């Protein structure tokens, strides 16, 4: 009923998205950026979507292009699956405690495209989360949320109230967005 | 079941209110202050009330008296329709993103009459929203919320977290109050 | 006994005042500036005067000239009605609470002409109170009180202790002056 | 003529009030909070009311609930005894010197419910007045005045100009309110 | 009924006071300090007392001793004339505008002896008011009020809200005290 | 289904807890610290738990040990009743307006044990709430929330946005925690 398949071929990347709004958290993500995969899996699971993401891009340069193209495509998919947006709650919000971190997200699904991102500590502008593969630079977080909001055509406010660890700060934000979205897309019985 | 009709004749104004708490957003407002009508329509619609407001007053002087008398009457109507307040959720809260603005409202329907209004930028104390008719001075916003809280006998906290445009700041507040109220008045299944 | 009729024809305006100090609050004011009419009605009523004011002036330019000429004429009328000022209380003072606002006025009816106006918030220097007709600029408040004091030949101190809303701040001042005057003009039984 | 009897049974407390506005200072107060009794006796005496207060409540927890319920009931009684408020002075004010302390109160009996409480030193937010029984926390002072104003439906401004001793600061305020009220409720011969 | 005659012989001075509280402003003062005479005449007149003061002292040294002894004696006279203080208003207050100056006094006639003097500009600590005879140093003002309060056994608060001219500041204070006293000593019809 | 009985014998105290998560607000608390009883009753009622608490301890020393042991035991009971935490909402949050106070709590029931307590005014570090029995020191509030979070093994964030009265600040926090918990423990229909 509320599904979408989006294919996006750029020079930098090739993306396929499959999205079902009324899912059970069946998620499979593979972008070539493992930390981003972890974040998108959290997003899909906590939003209770069914989500498949397959992306290959120029990760030799860095993750930026792949991360950005995926967020654009995912936003487009969300917009298409939403459709006319009839009989939904429309507004949603969620607080996410994650150890010392507290994050908040609020959404308006019918409101004009807009993104406000506040409260993130200054060291996240140059922090890197690195494992055995392509690293993730936390400066991209804002870029991801802006891209989603612009392509889904929604109002999205994301706040970090406080926090220290960049893994916790980042993960809390992705989960807050997911749970705000989940509440907003649900049918309203009025 | 939860209805009220209030008539209020003062020297300044004459008001009739009809309110149904368990409505479908059937709203008709005419006060002679078009921007106030827009705000009250948002209130009634987003609260899912059925609301009819008819007001005539001394708008040649300014909107103040009409705006204030209407808010007093509407508060009285809300109080009467609430009744004994049995088996309701009682507490309600809502975040409203509106472009760059974010507003929040929290209510306690059984709590003693109280109003706290914080966060509004300083230029709203002397801003005017003007069209082709009677203008609206945003300094009145606090007055409207205080009057409602006092006459409905409820605790009402309204916060502006941030924002720039006075139309957005004002509208976000009215909508936040509406959605907080909607949540609070709903039957609690416990 | 204590009555006065004053006619004042300038290039800007034409004014007629009728004043009885020992009245019952029978007041009729028409200046072409509705908010000023509201303020002068409050003045006459709360002072327990009988007061008729009829003024036409160059309101196409703005209210300034009409407001100023009326205040000058009203001051002259007050002075004439007071006469020799024999056996009156002479000193009067009053506090006026008006919602969040508190204003104070003190008068000496035999004291030399003087006016001190303090405590008014800075935004009142450029605030406008506007309805469906000629607006009122709150910067004129000081001008009105100075003009009255100068032409009645009295000492008049007006203070705003605190306040927010310009309608409340302005109305509180007019009422404070009225009640200070009422106390001062009353016969002293000593 | 201007009398009221109010009974108020809550879970926390049980209150009976008997109030005559046109009394001779015949006062009998018993709440189980001796310092509060002293304050209410001062109130009734200095206002020239006849006042009987009988209250029992959960003083094992603390005085808060009993003090608050009594103030609510007393406000209700004042409102009822006032009635239509015809031919009264309406405005009243009083300065109370008490050793080093100076307090002031101003009232408008027909003005909309409002309370402003300013000037109290910061140490009164955590000061206790303790004898051989249930103590009194001076932080409650504001709560008492707000409750009275809200339930009597009057404008009440209470200011402490300066002072040091908490017994003097508290007692001065109660007496200032009493004498402001006394002036306001008196018949106006105009 | 309320009269007193006080004789006070010190090494510095010899004083005779005759005071009637229920007078018509029949005042005759001669201390050898002309400006002080002017001030005491204002006091007696505005309080509506009948007052005779005759004082000779060591004015070759300066006015201090004469001014102080007279104030002590006058306080004693006021105390004696007051008597048991039965059926009086007890509390009194007055605002005195004098050109640019505004002064205030509040009294409690049954309250314990106390004097608070605030608001006087700093240049009054070394200002002199000089004519053709013995000059008056405005630093003495506080001393005069303290002495009166201590010997009459009353609470007396004197405030200067603002002002510039030392003659106006001083005279306003003496008149404020007089009118506060007048109100307080009057019979209370309750 | 979701019940727990916990017995805890220390040297300082002896505690018995009985907890049902799926209750109707049937609460009975007796610790020997009346204000704490009031707070725990609010907790149990607003969380819609069925809760029996029986505690005796060394209250002659002070409440600390009894308050702490009870919170530890209650946390343990909550943890046991939660069990595997299958099919619950997991996240919960609530705003509580209480007169001038606004408090907020957010919980993650599966998140690692953590407690963050922010926003409480500084005077609560040395404020006492005292009645006719064992008093309550508000400095303990943080200790209570930390103990609960540690023994239930949950993430608990408690914030005071603003407030003045210590009774209101404290009660608002306990109620916020209760309503956050209520939301989190409820079955999730997804
Ligand atoms: Mn980019
Ligand atoms: Mn992780
Ligand atoms: Mn108003
Ligand atoms: Mn709009
Ligand atoms: Mn001019
Ligand atoms: Mn008005
Ligand atoms: Mn309370
Ligand atoms: Mn005492
Ligand atoms: Mn000396
Ligand atoms: Mn002079
Ligand atoms: Mn401990
Ligand atoms: Mn309580």
XYZ file of C-alpha atoms and ligand atoms in Angstrom, chain B residues 64-65 68 140 143 147, chain C residues 98-100 165 167-168, chain D residues 112, ligand 3:
14
model
C -7.449 43.921 22.346
C -10.904 43.890 23.974
C -9.437 39.108 25.298
C -1.335 39.917 22.868
C -2.629 37.589 27.175
C -6.931 34.199 29.763
C -3.821 46.416 35.536
C -2.959 42.751 35.003
C 0.858 42.629 34.943
C 1.400 45.342 27.353
C -2.623 49.045 26.171
C -2.342 48.147 29.881
C -9.178 40.326 36.212
Mn -6.215 43.265 28.663
